[PDB]
Design a protein around this ligand. Structure first.
Ligand SMILES: Cc1cc2nc3c(=O)[nH]c(=O)nc-3n(C[C@H](O)[C@H](O)[C@H](O)COP(=O)(O)OP(=O)(O)OC[C@H]3O[C@@H](n4cnc5c(N)ncnc54)[C@H](O)[C@@H]3O)c2cc1C
Ligand SMILES: Cc1cc2nc3c(=O)[nH]c(=O)nc-3n(C[C@H](O)[C@H](O)[C@H](O)COP(=O)(O)OP(=O)(O)OC[C@H]3O[C@@H](n4cnc5c(N)ncnc54)[C@H](O)[C@@H]3O)c2cc1C
Ligand SMILES: NC(=O)c1ccc[n+]([C@@H]2O[C@H](COP(=O)([O-])OP(=O)(O)OC[C@H]3O[C@@H](n4cnc5c(N)ncnc54)[C@H](O)[C@@H]3O)[C@@H](O)[C@H]2O)c1
Ligand SMILES: NC(=O)c1ccc[n+]([C@@H]2O[C@H](COP(=O)([O-])OP(=O)(O)OC[C@H]3O[C@@H](n4cnc5c(N)ncnc54)[C@H](O)[C@@H]3O)[C@@H](O)[C@H]2O)c1
Lengths: 983, 52, 125, 63
């Protein structure tokens, strides 16, 4: 009867200290309360340290394995467990494993997870160099220990996971005896559908699991019936804030169907909690689902809430209001949180104003107990479920319950066993639910990774309890006593994103699209910025020469302006850029045709260029360098501006590359004449006016607009001191020839040009991450980035799955007006671009296999295309659009692949996806490419982090946004003074 | 530039030597900017998150 | 200092970023007659130190010292495969600089010859 | 050929013997201890003694 709560919108990353100022006093307990807790917890830990077979943490500790090594052995273990004849596995383990074929075993066992037929008698030659994850393990531990470790992995995989090639096989394997109930609830493997077909498969798997669980549910009432865990990202291929409109329309009926099926068996149905940027969207979906009248009269629906998030307490308020408003009973799982490292990395990458999670473990522990107290007081409408394997957390929640009724604890099969058995011994009324991981092999890898991060974490309770160096009393330290003071809440060694580069420079600010207040405000601000797009008159060859003459006159004064003053101008420019981000983002979208995230990212990059060049500028030009020499003599090295630089920029980064080149030249003490791409003069003119306002003298910087002919007039001018160019390889050569033709000084040419960028993915790569990174690298910004992926090499054993996943993912990209927040792929720059792209597409259709040709809206649009080539040699040009080419290869032919890459002459970006350090390192050793990206996408180089730029046909160097850039814009001068007369 | 002494016999690492304009491109021989010009830069970026 | 080890770049947690400097390829080194030893070796050893192989063409007037110098470099630890001496006039110098496979040119000599070399480089595709 | 010895005697002589025995099994520098610690890579157990000393003047322990 109460009002349905408003869409959830708590502040994303509030101040830790203020939260601690509330939680610390409230955490206080009386001496008798603490005494009970201490006793219960000691008893739990004693049982834990009894020592049963063991868990993953025991294996990692026993053989001192990295997470990567643990993962590789568990993968090999599953492959070995699925071999029909156990004697067959035994023979392999003793005779082949650890003897050789190290990389082959790692590759085959991993491919097995997506391609069962891939894993099936070789002959191992002696003396093989131990390489690969397994070979390195063998060198370190010895082959016999690796076999022993593998056998242990086999008992872990066989005992603690319910797995099969398909869901049906997993479910059959996980069944109980007869007319009996499953002793476990199902933690389903699936997450993050990449394709529409993935989302249907996961839906079907859940549906199938619900029937299996149902038919073996027992006759008791809730809470004493089994549960299933479900992930929203598994049920929708673009589960994200910017796609909220389609998500609400497509995902809800799906989740509703599954909830109804669970209701019919009167099951516990739990929606898992995922990344922080999906919190708000998930609550929207969950609320709309819960509202459906078909879910009345059922008490099993629920969701997980992560206490490691500052928003946790507010989520609980929201969930309770939801429950009262629809008059429902809910089962609510409280967890700490499984994605901590991800949240830290993301907030840093995204330049957020803070972290959505606590950064000290004790703060998470404090907030968990505080949230538990909150949930307990919401009984009986809310049935709390405390999922944790921490003995102190358990003991503390029990004490606060003052009873054992109306809540449960939870644990994952293979963890918390000794703990909860002992808890049950000491408290007969206590209930705990045990979940088993259940699913297909194709979903194992993604799940194993997350699982291993936590079992291998030093801070984890389970790990420490298993380490007998850690005394029992240490595991019993109260969280409040670790924090002591509110101002100590945040972790002292984790800087806020804005301080990522301190004390060098400030970081530009970003926006969290997953926070509706932030995204809505950004959208509004950009919308408020208007632009009719008035034509910008071209310059005549006379005006261009006048510009050079004027720049030439201004060089004397600018070059002699103190470096600190030049740097201050750049830094004020950065300030004005971010201050006016909406205006410039608006321009980037209108004139540049960029989607919102690409525009914001370019704005950030522009400001980063200013601050970074300002910072490097002071180091380089701030003072002379004293040279060692004899007594009675001084020797000083200085760097002076060269003269007038001509800066020529492209249309694809009309602001950041424009400003990067210009501010670099300016910082070095040069005056500049800048000619922007014909397509994007407006933003260039805005940038220049901004630089002037920031402190760049009118006499130091001139904008000349026009075509390649006006650009030619500038580069041919006899009085210029150098040229900084970014554009086509062909135009660079033309400029270079015009420069070399002159009889004057040989001036510097910095030329950054295209590439035919490859990615190499082997069978140890996670197909879902490959697909993400391939889709991003090749199709983001309509493939109009120089760093963009053009050629994917994929090992044949995984080619079909990887290609199919990229295609399915590409189909989910929204193509259209870049100003619509839901758009993934905007238009290409002009009619000429589209025609050239369409011509290549037409040609490729008659020369190579078409895997995907997306649907494009009328206008200057080109959709993602995927072609498979017979050989790489079929791709001979940089095609500047959303067009992926794929070649599959045999593992023994990597050399051929590397020759194919070397053959083009380009060398800008290269992607490598592989678990195998030795393979990654062999590739790096071999290639000369400027930017190599491993196990991530190939785009969005960050100033001062990924100095960007290639060689061969891809560029001259030095790398923009790196420490060798500014020097190229200057000239050296040595002053030697005989000082002897001074004495 | 040489002040109150002769103009010749630049010493390696003391007087980085070489000119501009019609006199040269740089970087100066026997100075700290020379070697870099003979090399190319390579940036290697690795997503290490799977390990921690 | 420069090539001894990589430079770590600041970045987000969960990511490593390292800057390295690698040899470019084959450098053509062309030297004058007026400092037949020191400028010859200066240019040659700089290129070698940066990890390039080198084809060196000495001034036609002073091949002997250059050949003695190359011999000394080989004896000092420079592999025969990393360093070759080619003697002759400006035409042989022109052949070297015109070669499509070279990765750079280090030259000391007349402003006029520098420009012709610059033009030959620019002319290549 | 290898000979295996068994400790043989009366309880009244055990303590004195156990002490000496435990000093060596609990020593960080002991081969048996390190071999049993999987953090120590096989190649580490294989370092030649001469390569640890390197120079005559480094023979004595510096601390
Ligand atoms: C049945 C079950 C279902 C679960 N469902 C989900 C889910 O849907 N979504 C989800 O995100 N998690 C979920 N989890 C939680 C996750 O998988 C881990 O098990 C959990 O976070 C560990 O908490 P703990 O009290 O057992 O271990 P503890 O060792 O006491 O705490 C470990 C954790 O503290 C936090 N942490 C670690 N370092 C820091 C730091 N420097 N600063 C702040 N916090 C830190 C983390 O959240 C981390 O996992 C579930 C767990 C179980 C058992
Ligand atoms: C059957 C048998 C009978 C034995 N009888 C005797 C005996 O009668 N008298 C006797 O004294 N020992 C005797 N020992 C030796 C002793 O008991 C140890 O077993 C032995 O010294 C260990 O050598 P190791 O090569 O097996 O182990 P390792 O780990 O290779 O070496 C361990 C040892 O190196 C030496 N050492 C350790 N640290 C240092 C240091 N900082 N500087 C210099 N040296 C160091 C010690 O001698 C020490 O025991 C006997 C051993 C066996 C197996
Ligand atoms: N390596 C990098 O960092 C990087 C960054 C951005 C773009 N690019 C490259 O730029 C290309 C796409 O952008 P584009 O179409 O604008 O490049 P483009 O060669 O077509 O022209 C770019 C710029 O040079 C000017 N220009 C054209 N002809 C000229 C001439 N004869 N003399 C002097 N100037 C002349 C243009 O008018 C313009 O401002 C791709 O090949 C791409 O990979 C490389
Ligand atoms: N700035 C300095 O550091 C420095 C140092 C020493 C000498 N120099 C200059 O060197 C000059 C005098 O000596 P030089 O007579 O040997 O110079 P030079 O121009 O006559 O030629 C010198 C070198 O280039 C080669 N060469 C000639 N024509 C060539 C061509 N068309 N293509 C490729 N290579 C060619 C020669 O055979 C020789 O090895 C002066 O102008 C002097 O100032 C400058």
């Amino acid at each position: 009867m109460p009002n349905i709560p408003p869409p959830f919108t708590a502040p994303y990353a509030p101040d830790d200290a203020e939260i601690a100022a509330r939680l610390l006093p409230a955490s206080h307990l009386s001496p008798p309360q603490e005494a009970r807790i201490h006793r219960t917890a000691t008893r739990l830990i004693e049982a834990i340290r009894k020592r049963r077979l063991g868990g993953v943490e025991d294996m990692l500790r026993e053989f001192a394995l990295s997470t990567k090594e643990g993962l590789a052995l568990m993968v090999l273990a599953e492959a070995l467990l699925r071999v029909p004849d156990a004697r067959t596995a035994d023979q392999f383990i003793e005779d082949k494993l650890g003897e050789g074929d190290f990389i082959h075993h790692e590759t085959k066992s991993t491919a097995f997870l997506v391609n069962a037929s891939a894993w099936a008698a070789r002959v191992i030659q002696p003396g093989e160099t131990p390489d690969g994850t397994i070979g390195r393990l063998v060198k370190r531990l010895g082959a016999p220990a690796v076999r022993t470790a593998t056998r242990q992995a086999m008992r872990l995989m066989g005992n603690h996971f319910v797995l099969g090639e398909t869901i049906e096989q997993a479910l059959e394997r996980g069944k109980p005896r007869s007319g009996q109930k499953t002793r476990y609830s199902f933690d389903m493997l699936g997450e993050g559908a990449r394709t529409a077909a993935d989302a249907r498969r996961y839906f079907d798997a859940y549906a199938s699991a619900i029937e299996t669980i149902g038919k073996a549910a027992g006759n008791h009432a809730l809470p004493d019936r089994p549960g299933i865990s479900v992930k929203l990202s598994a049920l929708h291929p673009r589960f994200e804030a910017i796609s909220r409109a389609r998500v609400m329309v497509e995902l809800v009926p799906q989740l509703l169907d599954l909830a109804q099926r669970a209701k019919a068996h009167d099951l516990n149905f739990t929606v898992d909690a995922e990344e922080a940027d999906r919190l708000e969207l998930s609550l929207d979906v969950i609320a709309a689902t819960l509202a459906d009248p078909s879910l009345k009269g059922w008490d099993g629906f629920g969701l997980a809430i992560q206490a490691y998030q500052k928003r946790a307490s507010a989520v609980i308020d929201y969930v309770d209001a939801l429950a009262r408003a629809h008059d429902r009973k809910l089962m609510v799982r409280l967890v700490k949180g499984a994605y901590w490292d991800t949240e830290i990395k993301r907030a840093q990458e995204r330049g957020l104003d803070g972290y959505p999670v606590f950064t000290r473990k004790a703060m998470t522990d404090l907030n968990y107990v505080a949230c538990a107290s909150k949930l307990l007081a919401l009984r009986p409408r809310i049935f709390p479920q405390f999922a944790t394997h921490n003995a102190l957390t358990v003991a503390t929640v029990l004490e606060m319950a003052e009873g054992s009724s109306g809540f449960e604890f939870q644990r994952l099969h293979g963890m918390g066993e000794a703990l909860y058995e002992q808890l049950a011994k000491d408290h007969a009324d206590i209930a705990y639910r045990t979940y088993a991981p259940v699913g297909s092999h194709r979903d194992l890898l993604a799940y194993l990774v997350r699982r291993l991060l936590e079992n291998g974490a030093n801070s984890s309770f389970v790990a420490q309890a298993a380490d007998y160096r850690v005394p029992v009393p240490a595991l019993l330290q109260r969280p409040a006593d670790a924090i002591v003071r509110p101002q100590a809440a945040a972790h002292p060694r984790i800087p806020l994103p804005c301080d990522l580069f301190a004390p060098e420079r400030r970081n530009s600010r970003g926006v969290e699209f997953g926070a509706r207040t932030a995204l809505d405000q950004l959208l509004t601000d950009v919308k408020a910025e208007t632009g009719d797009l008035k034509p910008i008159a071209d310059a005549t060859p006379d005006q261009a020469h006048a510009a050079v003459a004027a720049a030439r006159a201004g060089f004397a004064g600018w070059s002699r302006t103190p470096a600190g003053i030049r740097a201050a101008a750049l830094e004020q420019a950065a300030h004005l850029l971010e201050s006016r981000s909406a205006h410039f983002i608006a321009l980037l979208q209108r004139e540049g045709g960029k989607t919102l995230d690409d525009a914001l990212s370019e704005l950030r990059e522009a400001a980063d260029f200013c601050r970074y060049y300002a910072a490097q500028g002071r180091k380089l030009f701030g003072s002379e360098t004293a040279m060692p020499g004899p007594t009675g003599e001084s020797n000083a090295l200085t760097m002076r501006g060269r003269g007038v630089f001509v800066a020529i920029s492209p249309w694809n980064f009309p602001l950041a590359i424009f400003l990067g080149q210009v501010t670099a030249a300016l910082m070095a003490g040069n005056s500049v004449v800048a000619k922007p791409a014909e397509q994007t003069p407006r933003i260039a003119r805005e940038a220049v006016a901004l630089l002037h306002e920031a402190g760049i003298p009118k006499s130091a910087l001139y904008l000349v607009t026009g075509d390649g002919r006006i650009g030619a007039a500038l580069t041919a001018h006899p009085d210029i001191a150098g040229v900084v160019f970014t554009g086509s390889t062909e135009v660079a050569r033309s400029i270079n020839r015009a420069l070399a033709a002159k009889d004057g000084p040989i001036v510097p040419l910095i030329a950054e040009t295209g590439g035919i960028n490859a990615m190499i993915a082997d069978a140890t790569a996670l197909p879902e991450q490959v697909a993400d990174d391939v889709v991003t690298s090749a199709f983001r910004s309509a493939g109009q980035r120089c760093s963009a992926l053009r050629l994917l090499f994929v090992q044949e054993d995984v080619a079909d799955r990887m290609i199919e996943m990229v295609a399915g993912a590409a189909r989910e990209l929204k193509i259209g007006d870049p100003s619509d927040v839901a758009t993934h792929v905007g238009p290409v720059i002009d009619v000429e671009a589209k025609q050239r792209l369409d011509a290549h597409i037409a040609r490729m259709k008659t020369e190579a296999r078409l895997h995907f040709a997306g649907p494009a809206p009328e206008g200057c649009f080109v959709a993602p295309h995927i072609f498979e080539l017979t050989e790489a040699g079929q791709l001979t040009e940089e095609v500047f659009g959303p067009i992926l080419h794929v070649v599959r290869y045999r593992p023994e032919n990597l050399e051929r692949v590397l020759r194919a890459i070397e053959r083009t002459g380009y060398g800008l970006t290269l992607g490598v996806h592989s678990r195998i350090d030795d393979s990654i390192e062999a590739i790096i050793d071999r290639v000369q490419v400027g930017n190599i990206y491993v196990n991530r996408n190939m785009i969005g180089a960050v100033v001062g982090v990924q100095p960007f730029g290639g060689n061969g046909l891809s560029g001259t160097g030095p790398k923009a946004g790196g420490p060798h850039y500014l020097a190229r814009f200057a000239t050296e001068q040595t002053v030697t003074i005989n000082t002897a007369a001074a004495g």
